[PDB]
Design a binder for these strands. Structure first.
Ligand SMILES: [Cl-]
Ligand SMILES: [Cl-]
Ligand SMILES: [Cl-]
Ligand SMILES: [Cl-]
Ligand SMILES: [Mn+2]
Ligand SMILES: [Mn+2]
Ligand SMILES: [Mn+2]
Ligand SMILES: [Mn+2]
Ligand SMILES: [Mn+2]
Ligand SMILES: [Mn+2]
Ligand SMILES: [Mn+2]
Ligand SMILES: [Mn+2]
Ligand SMILES: [Mn+2]
Ligand SMILES: [Mn+2]
Lengths: 92, 99, 87, 108, 96, 77, 104, 91
DNA sequence: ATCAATATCCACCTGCAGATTCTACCAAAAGTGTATTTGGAAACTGCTCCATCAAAAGGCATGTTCAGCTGAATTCAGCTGAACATGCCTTTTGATGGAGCAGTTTCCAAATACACTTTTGGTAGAATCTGCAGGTGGATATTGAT
DNA sequence: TCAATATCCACCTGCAGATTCTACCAAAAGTGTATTTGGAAACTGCTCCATCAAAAGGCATGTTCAGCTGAATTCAGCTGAACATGCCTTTTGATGGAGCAGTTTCCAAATACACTTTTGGTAGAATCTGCAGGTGGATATTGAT
């Protein structure tokens, strides 16, 4: 009986932003719901993007455009900044 | 010394502050559960439920009703009333696209 | 082989004071007497719609147990995404 | 063989790039998936998680609590215009609502 | 000389325009507006003709529906005249 | 350019919406509302345009924007 | 021999099958799935065209136009429900005036 | 090239109203319609298969998706037609 | 509560412009003949949770009383918004170039797929650890009074 | 101003829930080979954009007044506040066993691939439907009794 979740990563992030703060199990469940939800939205939009443009590959470009479509304003700008930085660091 | 009495509305407002401060479910657990099981049984007999399934249904229902009461309240106030009435609910739901 | 007492008229379990509490959280100060029955009808419709879809998923999975995920999927596909009940 | 380095570490991330890649592969989103796509996605998911946790932590401390509960998540989300927009059709279980009484309802 | 009472011609116009399907905003100013708004998102843009027509069909459908809800809000308040507060109530309840 | 959406046009739209009487303040309000709507849709449309590496907004760009905003449009595919 | 002919359909079973295979819906597609789907799509098309044809005939037109489609759809409770968040271009709206706006 | 459902829509139209035609705009709306419902049903079927850890979309997923997406009588008649079509096809 | 006068709506008309239907050519898509693999159903079986009940304590639902205050009904006029006439200018409609883009096609370097082998981060369960729920009690702030 | 009441605000500790610890192993990472694809280069028409021009009809403006909205006012009956009563919910735990998951096996059903046959998209020709205006009767509105 092995069940995967985003709990440990959410917790690592939590320790990054609020070092002396914890989180209840219920709240962690809401965070896991959140990550899965956004995963689905972004991946789905990217899939649609690739399809519309007759591409068989979802690339970081599709992810980025999906992010711009789905996220409001500054949230979108900040997210794009994080993703871009991560991809360029990964490439090096 | 005539007994104490708050004027109509004071306790209501107090209750608003109280329940907007908190997060506990406002419908009784067991009666809601019976409601869910009755309704589900009229679709398929002999169904069982995960505990968290019924709790999920209750969270969804109460969130839905609370939001509906917000919109209903706005409709009542729009009509220069302070009392919500069925027509307020019906307007809110008509504009929501539920009706 | 020891079934529960048959469920009937349970919508009345959604009591007047419960509906009042829900309305209070919704910011309502004053409530017409006809609201309560109205609320019940509305709630029942909502519940019916959700549970119908939920049970459909349950039936597709060839299960006899409605799961939290069945409900979550029903809600999602009805545009009322619920957080906290995955896994 | 070379010593194992994880893609998350290579990308400077906390969220799991490998796992995200697998989920993209098996979610039937496209026939092919670029190397940068799961990195980008993981980074975005991590960032958004960080923003919500930041605000929720703030609310928790405002309430003199050291542990984040659903209430704090709801306060954080609804008091932030863009998060509120993003999660506009989402229910936070045990979140409650923002305190708000219409002015006309208050005594004179 | 003849004069219709206030409301008679309004009702006539309602029947007239609910009977028909033609676009109700002028083409050129709408196009001008669309290009202006678009410029603040991306430079050097061109538009397919049918893209502008698509935007106009969508916009007019949106406004007509909003006016339906607005009207319902006005009538709710025992008025027959729509006011900005009616629009604002409709848009708040829509989740806009 | 928003003032190019004239008072009689807004009146015609309201008539189709079943409105019999109209406050003078409606028109400006309507314009603001229209602008917001347009902005949102167009913002998404152009995003699609940019993803396709085009300089021309197509009918499909608009249709996709509308669809993803829950305002599905038939007739322009 | 075509699959549509074997299924008693007008809608294209082969094309629907290909669109399912290439739409990134699942890794595999059963043989009956595109038949079922094509049948459903054809049914709904038939229902809408039936009513729209009626509206066209009332308007003494031999050709169905968007207006007739809108009339057909909005005047049918279940079709209207199915297409609740859909805009029919050049469809207009149903004639409808609130009673309070009328004289007397 | 550029695909549409136009010829099939026209065949159906000829079935239900032999002496009735259709305008270009109306045909465009019918094509939009068919694509829309295709996407709704296929997408729900995809999710159904995923939720249940199945790699195959079968007629059962289509049917369940139809039951989820279509209201009442439309759902019942659609289910009837799909089932009938699959039965005629199989033999 | 009808009438006479008047204005607009709504079929119905014809002629012919143009929108739709018909046609024919031809890549591209579906079909087909075979071969081969595999997803998932069937049959098991272990072992979680789920259904139902039980007791007891007290939180909360119900029914009652009654009066404050709200919704509903009504009155009235000021000023807004409708209707209509008038004449100006913005949009519509049409012509003409041509520059900018879409939209295609070819071919390798680069990217991704996927299998095998190997390693480690992620998980479940156990062991620690510790907020905060309630329980207490007093300060402070609000309320409604006669 | 007070009496009455509710809410606010520290303070306290124990234990239910949260975090950390441990160690096995599922799945990610390294590596190598096979297969797909992105883009730079070189094209070709084809939609738009820019520009010019006339003229039509839609809009802007000003006037008059009808009637709608908002304010003021009055009243009766409904809903909120308070209280007793006692029901049934909540909490905690027992007892069976229904029904999920977990494994293993093996065909019916699906994919793969090479090649032919059939079909649907496209653009111009051939048909034939709407529509642009114009008529006359139906219908509806207005002002006067
Ligand atoms: Cl009412
Ligand atoms: Cl990539
Ligand atoms: Cl206003
Ligand atoms: Cl099948
Ligand atoms: Mn029953
Ligand atoms: Mn197998
Ligand atoms: Mn009042
Ligand atoms: Mn006057
Ligand atoms: Mn380790
Ligand atoms: Mn406490
Ligand atoms: Mn192993
Ligand atoms: Mn082979
Ligand atoms: Mn052919
Ligand atoms: Mn005419």
């Amino acid at each position: 009986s092995r069940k995967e979740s985003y709990s440990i990563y959410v917790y690592k992030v939590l320790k990054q932003v609020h070092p002396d703060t914890g989180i209840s199990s219920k709240a962690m469940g809401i965070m896991n719901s959140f990550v899965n939800d956004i995963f689905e939205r972004i991946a789905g939009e990217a899939s649609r993007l690739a399809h519309y443009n007759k591409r068989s590959t979802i690339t970081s470009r599709e992810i980025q455009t999906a992010v711009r479509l789905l996220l409001p304003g500054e949230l979108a700008k900040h997210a794009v900044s994080e993703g871009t930085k991560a991809v360029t660091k990964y490439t090096s | 010394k005539k007994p104490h009495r708050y004027r109509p509305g004071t306790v209501a407002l107090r209750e608003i502050r109280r329940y907007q401060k908190s997060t506990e479910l406002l419908i009784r657990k067991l009666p809601f559960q019976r409601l869910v099981r009755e309704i589900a049984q009229d679709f398929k007999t002999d169904l069982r439920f995960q505990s968290s399934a019924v709790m999920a249904l209750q969270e969804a229902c109460e969130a839905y009703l609370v939001g509906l009461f917000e919109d209903t309240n706005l409709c009542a106030i729009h009509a220069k009333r302070v009392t919500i009435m069925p027509k307020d609910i019906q307007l809110a739901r008509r504009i929501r696209g539920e009706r | 082989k020891r079934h529960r007492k048959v469920l009937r008229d349970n919508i009345q379990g959604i009591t007047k004071p419960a509906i009042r509490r829900l309305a209070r959280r919704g910011g309502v100060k004053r409530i017409s007497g006809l609201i309560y029955e109205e609320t019940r009808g509305v709630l029942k419709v909502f519940l019916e719609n959700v549970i119908r879809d939920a049970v459909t998923y349950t039936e597709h999975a060839k299960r006899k147990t409605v799961t939290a995920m069945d409900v979550v999927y029903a809600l999602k596909r009805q545009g009322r995404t619920l957080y906290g009940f995955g896994g | 063989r070379a010593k194992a380095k994880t893609r998350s570490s290579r990308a400077g991330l906390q969220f799991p790039v490998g796992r995200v890649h697998r989920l993209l592969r098996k979610g039937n989103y496209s026939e092919r998936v670029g190397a940068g796509a799961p990195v980008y996605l993981a980074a975005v998911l991590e960032y958004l998680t960080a923003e919500i946790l930041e605000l929720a932590g703030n609310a928790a401390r405002d309430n003199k609590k050291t542990r984040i509960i659903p209430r704090h998540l709801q306060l954080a989300i609804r008091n932030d215009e863009e998060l509120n927009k993003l999660l506009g059709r989402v229910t936070i279980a045990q979140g409650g609502v923002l305190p708000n009484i219409q002015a006309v309802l208050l005594p004179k």
